[PDB]
Amino acid sequence: LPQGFSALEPLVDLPIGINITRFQTLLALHRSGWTAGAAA
């Protein structure tokens, strides 16, 4: 992480009101089997 200060402004507020207790990350693959770029 770079050494600096950046305040994260809000973008959109979602009035869903649901019950969620988990998360999962989706990644994208590059076809040229499959190749994946450098990400973190």
Partner: protein, 50 residues
């Protein structure tokens, strides 16, 4: 037309097309169902989209 309440927030109230705007006659102060006192005519500050 059937209505019910659930866990989702209620965002159907809307503006209800109750148009009214005046700042010169000094009659009454009310906003968003919240009354009080005050006069609002001009400003120089810049707000944010949120």
């Amino acid at each position: 037309l059937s209505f019910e309440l659930l866990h989702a927030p209620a965002t159907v109230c809307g503006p209800k097309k109750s148009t009214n705007l005046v700042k010169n006659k000094c009659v009454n102060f009310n906003f968003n169902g919240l009354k009080g006192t005050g006069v609002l005519t001009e400003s120089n500050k810049k707000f944010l989209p949120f």
